[PDB]
Tab-separated table of C-alpha atoms in Angstrom:
chain	number	residue	atom	x	y	z
L	147	UNK	CA	93.764	44.220	127.314
L	148	UNK	CA	97.278	44.689	126.056
L	149	UNK	CA	97.586	41.295	124.345
L	150	UNK	CA	95.110	42.044	121.531
L	151	UNK	CA	96.007	45.252	119.691
L	152	UNK	CA	95.497	44.780	115.971
L	153	UNK	CA	96.406	47.281	113.300
L	154	UNK	CA	92.694	48.083	113.072
L	155	UNK	CA	93.144	50.296	116.146
L	156	UNK	CA	95.601	52.707	114.529
L	157	UNK	CA	94.682	56.297	115.476
L	158	UNK	CA	91.664	55.734	117.669
L	159	UNK	CA	90.991	56.375	121.341
L	160	UNK	CA	92.031	53.174	123.117
L	161	UNK	CA	92.633	52.848	126.839
L	162	UNK	CA	94.458	50.091	128.664
L	163	UNK	CA	96.075	49.140	131.971
L	164	UNK	CA	99.588	48.108	132.939
L	165	UNK	CA	102.584	48.628	135.215
L	166	UNK	CA	105.088	51.439	134.718
L	167	UNK	CA	108.680	50.224	134.769
L	168	UNK	CA	110.862	53.296	134.451
L	169	UNK	CA	110.628	56.946	133.454
L	170	UNK	CA	113.198	59.136	131.698
L	171	UNK	CA	114.868	62.541	131.881
L	172	UNK	CA	112.952	65.812	131.525
L	173	UNK	CA	113.531	67.267	128.070
L	174	UNK	CA	112.779	70.654	126.517
L	175	UNK	CA	110.820	71.414	123.365
L	176	UNK	CA	110.087	74.911	122.111
L	177	UNK	CA	106.818	76.778	121.583
L	178	UNK	CA	107.720	80.334	120.557
L	179	UNK	CA	111.067	81.014	118.933
L	180	UNK	CA	112.213	84.134	117.122
L	181	UNK	CA	114.705	83.948	114.326
L	182	UNK	CA	117.104	86.114	112.283
L	183	UNK	CA	118.780	85.799	108.862
L	184	UNK	CA	122.520	86.012	109.282
L	185	UNK	CA	123.027	87.693	105.884
L	186	UNK	CA	119.831	89.629	105.124
L	187	UNK	CA	119.310	90.712	108.772
L	188	UNK	CA	115.594	89.956	108.808
L	189	UNK	CA	113.348	89.094	111.763
L	190	UNK	CA	110.352	86.764	112.093
L	191	UNK	CA	108.631	84.626	114.699
L	192	UNK	CA	107.202	81.107	114.770
L	193	UNK	CA	104.595	79.579	117.047
L	194	UNK	CA	104.090	75.822	117.119
L	195	UNK	CA	101.336	74.084	119.036
L	196	UNK	CA	101.201	70.273	118.771
L	197	UNK	CA	104.585	68.778	119.362
L	198	UNK	CA	104.488	64.949	119.415
L	199	UNK	CA	105.272	63.757	115.886
L	200	UNK	CA	108.581	62.533	117.141
L	201	UNK	CA	110.714	61.873	114.041
L	202	UNK	CA	108.830	64.358	111.856
L	203	UNK	CA	109.753	66.934	112.893
L	204	UNK	CA	106.767	69.132	113.745
L	205	UNK	CA	108.394	72.087	111.978
L	206	UNK	CA	111.777	73.147	110.680
L	207	UNK	CA	113.389	76.473	110.147
L	208	UNK	CA	112.596	77.747	106.642
L	209	UNK	CA	115.257	77.196	104.010
L	210	UNK	CA	115.286	80.580	102.211
L	211	UNK	CA	115.802	84.095	103.555
L	212	UNK	CA	112.097	84.737	102.910
L	213	UNK	CA	112.381	88.482	102.165
L	214	UNK	CA	111.943	88.103	98.396
L	215	UNK	CA	108.245	87.448	99.048
L	216	UNK	CA	107.511	91.108	99.838
L	217	UNK	CA	104.633	93.408	98.885
L	218	UNK	CA	106.694	96.640	99.040
L	219	UNK	CA	108.810	98.519	96.489
L	220	UNK	CA	111.843	99.885	98.361
L	221	UNK	CA	112.282	96.675	100.341
L	222	UNK	CA	112.544	94.918	96.978
L	223	UNK	CA	114.928	97.692	95.939
L	224	UNK	CA	117.455	97.173	98.731
L	225	UNK	CA	117.021	93.400	98.465
L	226	UNK	CA	117.785	93.882	94.769
L	227	UNK	CA	120.853	96.083	95.268
L	228	UNK	CA	122.543	93.806	97.766
L	229	UNK	CA	124.831	93.139	94.806
L	230	UNK	CA	125.526	95.188	91.664
L	231	UNK	CA	123.894	93.279	88.777
L	232	UNK	CA	122.781	89.930	90.243
L	233	UNK	CA	120.285	89.371	93.031
L	234	UNK	CA	121.401	88.610	96.570
L	235	UNK	CA	120.813	85.456	98.590
L	236	UNK	CA	120.977	84.641	102.268
L	237	UNK	CA	120.745	81.000	101.094
L	238	UNK	CA	121.210	78.045	101.916
L	239	UNK	CA	119.426	77.637	105.306
L	240	UNK	CA	120.521	80.851	106.901
L	241	UNK	CA	118.492	81.363	110.020
L	242	UNK	CA	119.671	81.505	113.636
L	243	UNK	CA	117.563	81.015	116.749
A	151	UNK	CA	132.980	115.557	111.023
A	152	UNK	CA	134.850	114.676	107.863
A	153	UNK	CA	137.464	117.481	107.270
A	154	UNK	CA	138.672	116.368	103.840
A	155	UNK	CA	141.746	117.626	101.929
A	156	UNK	CA	142.551	119.088	98.520
A	157	UNK	CA	146.055	118.354	97.131
A	158	UNK	CA	146.572	121.383	94.926
A	159	UNK	CA	149.535	120.752	92.650
A	160	UNK	CA	152.169	120.618	90.935
A	161	UNK	CA	151.718	116.919	89.999
A	162	UNK	CA	154.584	114.659	89.507
A	163	UNK	CA	154.302	113.991	85.745
A	164	UNK	CA	150.682	112.896	86.084
A	165	UNK	CA	149.462	115.844	83.989
A	166	UNK	CA	147.774	113.595	81.499
A	167	UNK	CA	144.823	114.197	79.205
A	168	UNK	CA	142.144	111.477	79.015
A	169	UNK	CA	143.422	110.261	75.669
A	170	UNK	CA	146.437	108.584	77.302
A	171	UNK	CA	144.852	107.531	80.592
A	172	UNK	CA	144.420	103.730	80.764
A	173	UNK	CA	145.564	101.353	82.186
A	174	UNK	CA	148.880	100.979	83.888
A	175	UNK	CA	148.146	104.254	85.681
A	176	UNK	CA	145.371	102.513	87.528
A	177	UNK	CA	144.685	103.013	91.262
A	178	UNK	CA	147.028	105.996	91.601
A	179	UNK	CA	146.454	109.722	91.841
A	180	UNK	CA	145.842	111.296	88.452
A	181	UNK	CA	145.128	114.855	87.230
A	182	UNK	CA	142.839	115.140	84.186
A	183	UNK	CA	141.544	118.130	82.210
A	184	UNK	CA	139.011	118.478	79.424
A	185	UNK	CA	135.548	119.577	78.348
A	186	UNK	CA	132.517	118.753	80.498
A	187	UNK	CA	129.610	116.967	78.821
A	188	UNK	CA	126.987	115.568	79.509
A	189	UNK	CA	126.267	116.509	83.169
A	190	UNK	CA	123.406	114.587	84.797
A	191	UNK	CA	120.808	115.540	87.397
A	192	UNK	CA	121.338	116.001	91.138
A	193	UNK	CA	119.919	113.248	93.307
A	194	UNK	CA	120.003	112.851	97.092
A	195	UNK	CA	121.415	109.718	98.687
A	196	UNK	CA	120.339	108.148	101.980
A	197	UNK	CA	122.715	107.359	104.855
A	198	UNK	CA	120.917	107.087	108.200
A	199	UNK	CA	117.336	106.143	108.933
A	200	UNK	CA	115.313	107.013	112.036
A	201	UNK	CA	112.106	105.192	112.992
A	202	UNK	CA	109.451	105.953	115.565
A	203	UNK	CA	107.972	102.976	117.359
A	204	UNK	CA	104.416	102.382	118.527
A	205	UNK	CA	103.411	102.180	121.211
A	206	UNK	CA	106.443	101.939	123.474
A	207	UNK	CA	107.867	105.285	122.388
A	208	UNK	CA	111.511	104.687	121.520
A	209	UNK	CA	113.281	105.940	118.441
A	210	UNK	CA	115.477	103.614	116.422
A	211	UNK	CA	118.365	103.783	114.117
A	212	UNK	CA	120.176	102.066	111.244
A	213	UNK	CA	123.171	102.736	109.006
A	214	UNK	CA	123.918	102.276	105.317
A	215	UNK	CA	127.097	102.102	103.245
A	216	UNK	CA	128.180	101.670	99.642
A	217	UNK	CA	131.134	101.088	97.340
A	218	UNK	CA	131.727	104.798	96.656
A	219	UNK	CA	132.687	105.427	100.299
A	220	UNK	CA	136.176	105.997	101.698
A	221	UNK	CA	138.756	104.617	99.452
A	222	UNK	CA	139.526	101.207	100.985
A	223	UNK	CA	137.425	98.087	100.553
A	224	UNK	CA	135.181	96.395	103.075
A	225	UNK	CA	133.398	93.048	103.297
A	226	UNK	CA	129.908	94.116	102.223
A	227	UNK	CA	126.814	93.479	104.326
A	228	UNK	CA	123.449	94.559	102.916
A	229	UNK	CA	120.668	95.388	105.325
A	230	UNK	CA	116.910	95.461	104.801
A	231	UNK	CA	115.108	98.781	105.189
A	232	UNK	CA	113.631	97.823	108.530
A	233	UNK	CA	110.030	97.275	109.582
A	234	UNK	CA	108.492	95.275	112.457
A	235	UNK	CA	111.195	94.964	115.089
A	236	UNK	CA	111.286	92.254	117.716
A	237	UNK	CA	108.861	92.060	119.325
A	238	UNK	CA	106.246	92.584	116.609
A	239	UNK	CA	105.287	96.263	116.404
A	240	UNK	CA	104.656	98.628	113.535
A	241	UNK	CA	107.569	100.957	112.772
A	242	UNK	CA	106.285	104.119	111.140
A	243	UNK	CA	109.245	105.920	109.606
A	244	UNK	CA	110.142	109.583	109.782
A	245	UNK	CA	111.805	112.323	107.812
A	246	UNK	CA	113.585	115.469	108.873
A	247	UNK	CA	115.834	113.602	111.261
A	248	UNK	CA	117.081	111.084	108.714
A	249	UNK	CA	120.123	112.489	106.975
A	250	UNK	CA	120.697	112.867	103.248
A	251	UNK	CA	123.810	113.743	101.240
A	252	UNK	CA	123.870	114.762	97.588
A	253	UNK	CA	125.335	112.918	94.606
A	254	UNK	CA	126.119	113.767	90.969
A	255	UNK	CA	128.188	112.352	88.094
A	256	UNK	CA	129.713	114.120	85.078
A	257	UNK	CA	131.752	112.860	82.126
A	258	UNK	CA	134.877	114.369	80.591
A	259	UNK	CA	136.069	114.418	76.952
A	260	UNK	CA	139.531	115.487	75.837
A	261	UNK	CA	140.209	119.008	74.639
A	262	UNK	CA	139.449	119.933	71.003
A	263	UNK	CA	142.345	122.396	70.923
A	264	UNK	CA	144.630	119.529	72.018
A	265	UNK	CA	142.991	116.676	70.058
A	266	UNK	CA	144.496	114.946	67.015
A	267	UNK	CA	143.584	115.857	63.436
A	268	UNK	CA	140.376	113.955	62.991
A	269	UNK	CA	139.562	110.901	65.100
A	270	UNK	CA	136.837	109.883	67.435
A	271	UNK	CA	137.110	111.212	70.985
A	272	UNK	CA	137.408	108.913	73.967
A	273	UNK	CA	136.048	109.784	77.370
A	274	UNK	CA	135.842	108.826	81.055
A	275	UNK	CA	133.440	109.706	83.857
A	276	UNK	CA	133.710	111.273	87.295
A	277	UNK	CA	131.635	110.833	90.465
A	278	UNK	CA	131.268	113.858	92.720
G	232	UNK	CA	119.079	118.186	99.606
G	233	UNK	CA	118.885	118.967	103.340
G	234	UNK	CA	115.300	120.214	103.440
G	235	UNK	CA	113.631	116.821	102.981
G	236	UNK	CA	110.738	116.820	105.394
G	237	UNK	CA	110.365	120.478	106.274
G	238	UNK	CA	107.635	122.887	105.124
G	239	UNK	CA	108.994	125.243	102.463
G	240	UNK	CA	107.808	127.770	99.888
G	241	UNK	CA	108.761	128.215	96.225
G	242	UNK	CA	107.861	130.480	93.304
G	243	UNK	CA	107.916	130.033	89.547
G	244	UNK	CA	105.894	129.596	86.362
G	245	UNK	CA	103.659	126.545	86.009
G	246	UNK	CA	104.071	124.641	82.741
G	247	UNK	CA	102.447	121.362	81.577
G	248	UNK	CA	99.604	120.830	83.996
G	249	UNK	CA	97.906	117.528	83.240
G	250	UNK	CA	94.388	116.119	83.560
G	251	UNK	CA	92.519	114.930	86.634
G	252	UNK	CA	91.984	111.164	86.943
G	253	UNK	CA	91.118	109.044	89.981
G	254	UNK	CA	93.759	107.188	91.959
G	255	UNK	CA	92.954	104.448	94.419
G	256	UNK	CA	93.500	104.524	98.171
G	257	UNK	CA	91.825	101.449	99.711
G	258	UNK	CA	90.206	98.620	97.773
G	259	UNK	CA	87.151	96.769	99.056
G	260	UNK	CA	86.498	93.100	98.323
G	261	UNK	CA	83.562	90.860	99.241
G	262	UNK	CA	83.904	87.256	100.309
G	263	UNK	CA	80.472	85.834	99.257
G	264	UNK	CA	80.563	82.907	101.707
G	265	UNK	CA	81.843	84.236	105.019
G	266	UNK	CA	80.280	87.628	104.373
G	267	UNK	CA	83.228	89.788	105.368
G	268	UNK	CA	84.675	92.844	103.646
G	269	UNK	CA	88.421	92.447	103.342
G	270	UNK	CA	90.138	95.783	102.833
G	271	UNK	CA	93.641	96.500	101.582
G	272	UNK	CA	95.688	99.674	101.635
G	273	UNK	CA	97.884	100.675	98.686
G	274	UNK	CA	100.901	102.942	99.169
G	275	UNK	CA	103.007	102.192	96.114
G	276	UNK	CA	102.716	102.935	92.436
G	277	UNK	CA	101.640	99.439	91.392
G	278	UNK	CA	99.664	96.928	93.429
G	279	UNK	CA	98.496	93.355	93.073
G	280	UNK	CA	95.103	91.717	93.629
G	281	UNK	CA	94.739	88.969	96.174
G	282	UNK	CA	93.205	85.558	96.678
G	283	UNK	CA	91.184	83.190	98.683
G	284	UNK	CA	90.468	85.112	101.962
G	285	UNK	CA	92.149	86.525	105.041
G	286	UNK	CA	89.231	86.711	107.483
G	287	UNK	CA	88.822	84.835	110.735
G	288	UNK	CA	86.074	82.568	109.404
G	289	UNK	CA	87.105	81.639	105.889
G	290	UNK	CA	90.473	81.065	107.502
G	291	UNK	CA	90.892	78.060	109.859
G	292	UNK	CA	88.447	76.156	107.640
G	293	UNK	CA	89.005	73.606	104.919
G	294	UNK	CA	86.975	75.295	102.186
G	295	UNK	CA	88.316	78.785	101.615
G	296	UNK	CA	86.094	81.139	99.657
G	297	UNK	CA	86.988	83.288	96.675
G	298	UNK	CA	86.794	87.080	96.620
G	299	UNK	CA	86.259	89.717	93.933
G	300	UNK	CA	86.174	93.483	94.135
G	301	UNK	CA	83.584	96.268	93.991
G	302	UNK	CA	83.789	100.000	93.306
G	303	UNK	CA	81.028	101.627	95.350
G	304	UNK	CA	82.777	100.889	98.638
G	305	UNK	CA	86.403	101.872	98.019
G	306	UNK	CA	87.847	105.345	98.681
G	307	UNK	CA	89.045	107.518	95.811
G	308	UNK	CA	90.896	110.799	95.572
G	309	UNK	CA	91.587	113.186	92.723
G	310	UNK	CA	95.145	113.428	91.496
G	311	UNK	CA	96.974	115.818	89.197
G	312	UNK	CA	100.626	116.638	88.614
G	313	UNK	CA	102.423	119.603	87.066
G	314	UNK	CA	105.838	121.272	86.933
G	315	UNK	CA	107.412	124.489	88.202
G	316	UNK	CA	110.031	126.106	86.009
G	317	UNK	CA	112.456	128.689	87.381
G	318	UNK	CA	111.194	132.285	87.340
G	319	UNK	CA	114.096	133.419	85.038
G	320	UNK	CA	114.716	136.528	87.143
G	321	UNK	CA	116.447	134.748	90.044
G	322	UNK	CA	119.075	132.904	87.961
G	323	UNK	CA	122.869	133.381	87.921
G	324	UNK	CA	124.607	134.879	84.932
G	325	UNK	CA	125.202	131.863	82.710
G	326	UNK	CA	122.605	129.253	83.555
G	327	UNK	CA	119.336	127.658	82.402
G	328	UNK	CA	116.025	127.260	84.315
G	329	UNK	CA	115.513	123.943	86.120
G	330	UNK	CA	112.295	122.174	87.130
G	331	UNK	CA	110.679	120.317	90.030
G	332	UNK	CA	107.548	118.174	90.133
G	333	UNK	CA	104.408	118.674	92.208
G	334	UNK	CA	101.694	116.234	93.162
G	335	UNK	CA	98.290	117.663	94.121
G	336	UNK	CA	95.670	115.740	96.097
G	337	UNK	CA	92.196	116.586	97.282
G	338	UNK	CA	90.192	119.804	97.307
G	339	UNK	CA	93.046	121.992	96.040
G	340	UNK	CA	92.697	120.551	92.499
G	341	UNK	CA	91.778	122.735	89.465
G	342	UNK	CA	93.587	125.803	90.788
G	343	UNK	CA	96.795	125.570	88.732
G	344	UNK	CA	96.343	127.220	85.432
G	345	UNK	CA	99.220	127.030	82.923
G	346	UNK	CA	101.382	130.075	82.346
G	347	UNK	CA	101.148	131.912	85.676
G	348	UNK	CA	103.226	133.195	88.602
G	349	UNK	CA	102.475	131.242	91.729
G	350	UNK	CA	103.603	130.766	95.350
G	351	UNK	CA	103.135	127.109	96.255
G	352	UNK	CA	103.829	126.111	99.860
G	353	UNK	CA	104.142	122.460	100.700
G	354	UNK	CA	106.199	119.732	102.272
G	355	UNK	CA	109.013	117.987	100.478
G	356	UNK	CA	109.178	114.172	100.485
G	357	UNK	CA	111.137	111.396	98.735
G	358	UNK	CA	109.732	108.825	96.268
G	359	UNK	CA	111.811	105.815	95.245
G	360	UNK	CA	113.380	105.523	91.772
G	361	UNK	CA	116.689	105.602	90.041
G	362	UNK	CA	117.210	105.741	86.331
G	363	UNK	CA	119.148	103.213	84.316
G	364	UNK	CA	119.999	100.105	86.304
G	365	UNK	CA	123.733	100.408	85.683
G	366	UNK	CA	123.925	103.878	87.227
G	367	UNK	CA	122.566	103.010	90.667
G	368	UNK	CA	124.749	103.167	93.768
G	369	UNK	CA	122.064	102.798	96.454
G	370	UNK	CA	119.781	104.177	97.630
G	371	UNK	CA	119.158	107.211	95.384
G	372	UNK	CA	115.780	108.721	95.966
G	373	UNK	CA	114.508	111.329	93.411
G	374	UNK	CA	112.387	113.961	95.280
G	375	UNK	CA	109.079	115.758	94.622
G	376	UNK	CA	107.001	118.464	96.355
G	377	UNK	CA	103.618	117.833	97.950
G	378	UNK	CA	101.185	120.766	97.760
G	379	UNK	CA	99.361	122.342	100.714
G	380	UNK	CA	98.193	125.886	99.894
G	381	UNK	CA	98.363	127.883	96.683
G	382	UNK	CA	98.633	131.676	96.511
G	383	UNK	CA	98.748	133.465	93.168
G	384	UNK	CA	100.152	136.745	92.177
G	385	UNK	CA	98.010	138.543	89.567
R	2	UNK	CA	110.816	104.817	100.862
R	3	UNK	CA	107.494	104.095	102.540
R	4	UNK	CA	106.249	101.387	104.924
R	5	UNK	CA	104.153	98.304	104.365
R	6	UNK	CA	100.384	98.125	103.803
R	7	UNK	CA	97.908	96.307	106.028
R	8	UNK	CA	94.974	93.929	105.582
R	9	UNK	CA	91.937	93.608	107.853
R	10	UNK	CA	88.203	92.917	107.746
R	11	UNK	CA	84.709	93.575	109.157
R	12	UNK	CA	81.597	91.328	109.274
R	13	UNK	CA	78.836	93.010	107.307
R	14	UNK	CA	76.468	90.554	105.683
R	15	UNK	CA	75.110	87.056	106.294
R	16	UNK	CA	75.561	84.633	104.787
R	17	UNK	CA	75.753	81.102	103.384
R	18	UNK	CA	74.806	79.445	106.679
R	19	UNK	CA	72.972	76.110	106.364
R	20	UNK	CA	75.198	75.356	108.487
R	21	UNK	CA	77.090	72.366	107.203
R	22	UNK	CA	78.668	71.312	110.572
R	23	UNK	CA	82.262	71.903	109.559
R	24	UNK	CA	85.478	73.187	111.165
R	25	UNK	CA	83.883	76.245	112.717
R	26	UNK	CA	80.389	76.077	114.231
R	27	UNK	CA	81.416	72.919	115.931
R	28	UNK	CA	83.129	75.274	118.377
R	29	UNK	CA	79.702	76.825	118.987
R	30	UNK	CA	78.745	73.545	120.668
R	31	UNK	CA	81.686	73.711	123.061
R	32	UNK	CA	81.201	77.333	123.936
R	33	UNK	CA	77.702	76.006	124.549
R	34	UNK	CA	79.166	73.059	126.443
R	35	UNK	CA	81.444	74.630	129.029
R	36	UNK	CA	79.308	77.686	129.738
R	37	UNK	CA	75.802	76.376	129.127
R	38	UNK	CA	75.931	73.112	131.024
R	39	UNK	CA	74.551	72.365	134.481
R	40	UNK	CA	74.053	68.883	135.804
R	41	UNK	CA	71.626	68.486	138.657
R	42	UNK	CA	71.778	70.613	140.518
R	43	UNK	CA	75.011	72.475	139.927
R	44	UNK	CA	77.288	73.411	137.041
R	45	UNK	CA	80.677	71.797	137.438
R	46	UNK	CA	83.066	72.897	134.697
R	47	UNK	CA	82.781	76.663	135.005
R	48	UNK	CA	83.668	76.594	138.705
R	49	UNK	CA	86.672	74.361	138.058
């Protein structure tokens, strides 16, 4: 019954029974979204699966242009010679859905 | 196609040796003579890539620029040597269709028949 | 610099041919808990070893394993490089002989004796480098010549 | 100016398998639950 719900029941399977007053408007979350750095011109993709952690959020866009973590030589070369003596940066949070 | 020019002269009292070059003559058109040392090696420079895709079978394409291009300036945008387009597919590169254009730099000292009595020489450098 | 990729033929005198030492192609790890064999390809000059696992069983679990390599399951290849100097008969009037590197892989090794006259035919690729950091303009490439088939005079 | 390397695998040897009833090989019980169930006298989940 709905009257007795202690804090001992946090995150367990608990069923109940009531009367539904009023619904709301159909919203839209995302599951598969593909991104792009607006400076570096990089591409990625993100899948997310479980999507009710309401003020979390479940995920965010990453906050760095993410190409400096690369296991190749010439990709590190062009990402090094974006400028002339200092390294380049897409940053801060550069991505675009 | 480029179709560049020459400007053979007859130059305008800009006949100056590289002792008296700098710096209020800057960003003008200047004629310089002297000895050539110490000429470097010839290296090829990349301009256009071409990538084959798998498995859909479409070529691709990308451009590149620098600061030693045509003589104006431009708001620079770097660009990663591409791999894994959207949607996720391996992009095996190619050669033979991707262009290349040569590049070489030499430096110029002033003339010893024109130099002062005994002083150190002073020199500049030229991109070709 | 407009032959990069084709299949060409040169001639000259070999000088400074080096030794033969193994270079790695794929590296084979073992996982010790999942039981997989996680490979890795290496294209570049320098590589880096890796960590916990990348399988489909030691992944999506809490307790990742730890992996370490082995040398009887990788794939090696012989490797030897040398230089071609200009023949000194095909030069203009006031110049000096140049040079051009050659890599040699596989069965063709131990056929390049120093001080000869040779006709190497191979394909002509790029390999990334530039010299001092303050001289780079992007994306200068520094070529070599792969070897395919070696035909000697004399 | 090459392209990137790749990483993959192949199952060769077994294997530290007590098995400790952890994140995988619980899923063996549900692949055994949907497929390999039949209440009397008819399996119900596979047809649904």
